[PDB]
Amino acid sequence: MENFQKVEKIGEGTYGVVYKARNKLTGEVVALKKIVPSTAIREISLLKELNHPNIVKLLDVIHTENKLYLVFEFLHQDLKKFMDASALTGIPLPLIKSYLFQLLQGLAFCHSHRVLHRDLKPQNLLINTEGAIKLADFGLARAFEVVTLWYRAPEILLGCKYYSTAVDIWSLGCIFAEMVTRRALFPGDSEIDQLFRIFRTLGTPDEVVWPGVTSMPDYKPSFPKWARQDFSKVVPPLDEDGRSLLSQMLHYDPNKRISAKAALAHPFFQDVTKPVPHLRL
Numbered sequence: 001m002e003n004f005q006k007v008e009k010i011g012e013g014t015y016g017v018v019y020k021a022r023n024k025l026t027g028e029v030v031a032l033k034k035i036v037p038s039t040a041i042r043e044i045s046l047l048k049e050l051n052h053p054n055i056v057k058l059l060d061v062i063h064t065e066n067k068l069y070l071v072f073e074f075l076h077q078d079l080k081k082f083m084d085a086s087a088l089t090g091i092p093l094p095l096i097k098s099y100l101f102q103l104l105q106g107l108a109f110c111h112s113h114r115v116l117h118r119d120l121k122p123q124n125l126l127i128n129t130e131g132a133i134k135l136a137d138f139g140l141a142r143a144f145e146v147v148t149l150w151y152r153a154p155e156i157l158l159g160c161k162y163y164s165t166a167v168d169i170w171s172l173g174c175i176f177a178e179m180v181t182r183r184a185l186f187p188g189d190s191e192i193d194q195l196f197r198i199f200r201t202l203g204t205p206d207e208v209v210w211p212g213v214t215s216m217p218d219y220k221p222s223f224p225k226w227a228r229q230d231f232s233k234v235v236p237p238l239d240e241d242g243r244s245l246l247s248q249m250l251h252y253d254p255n256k257r258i259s260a261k262a263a264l265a266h267p268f269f270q271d272v273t274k275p276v277p278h279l280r281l
């Protein structure tokens with residue numbers, strides 16, 4: 001730690017405390033995350049390689065005195081605070097669209113290298129004054145105070161052990177709908193409550209929409225059978241392009257669910273721009 005001065009506690013991460021810190025030598029301000037098996041060492045080292053404009057840059061990995069610290073480029077806000085701050089009027093749609101597009105870019109990159117996030121949520125989406133948004137804590141999940149289930153894909157909730165990059169698309173779809181409506185899509189407060197909120201909005205899945213569902217580990221023939229709601233009721237006043245895209249990001253069957261790369265080609269992004277957010281630091 002010596003080479004750093006903790007300027008302040010930024011928050012209580014999943015894997016430990018987060019500090020804003022200044023490199024006593026380089027002068028650079030940074031995010032310092034306190035988290036040791038060699039596997040965790042090997043995973044995090046891979047992470048140093050996947051550099052992308054929409055991934056929070058992992059500056060350094062300090063394994064000293066059998067402790068683990070990750071050093072990340074610092075950004076001044078996350079999407080959760082910005083949403084609360086924009087509750088009154090909502091985030092403008094052009095900004096929502098730009099955030100969605102850049103996030104999809106980040107995902108398409110990670111996914112092309114077979115790296116999933118697994119835990120997307122507005123808290124780990126960081127933004128700057130220049131209109132950029134970045135995925136934070138990418139890959140930390142494989143490598144390793146209630147954790148939110150609100151963005152969890154249903155195949156995870158159903159006990160699927162070998163899930164795909166589709167889980168991140170699902171989470172990002174949930175975040176998309178939340179930006180638009182200013183309300184969490186599926187605010188579950190247990191794994192069953194989470195699952196059943198999903199069922200209530202999208203319909204109880206069956207073998208028609210999701211072949212193999214009924215054979216999943218935690219699936220029960222006894223689940224109530226709810227009817228799917230219509231999306232126009234779910235995310236007004238998102239336009240038809242947005243709704244089409246959202247519906248594809250929220251497909252039950254992970255194999256039907258749109259990829260990040262395919263989502264980038266959707267006509268919703270036909271008119272994408274890069275607006276600057278007004279944020280007060």
Ligand SMILES: O=C(Nc1ccc(F)cc1)c1n[nH]cc1NC(=O)c1c(F)cccc1F
Binds near residue numbers: 014033074
């Ligand atoms: O937290 C960060 N920035 C930030 C600063 C002030 C805020 F109000 C808000 C945000 C940050 N900058 N760079 C990386 C960061 N955070 C993470 O990587 C991170 C983490 F280590 C653990 C959990 C969530 C994270 F986003």
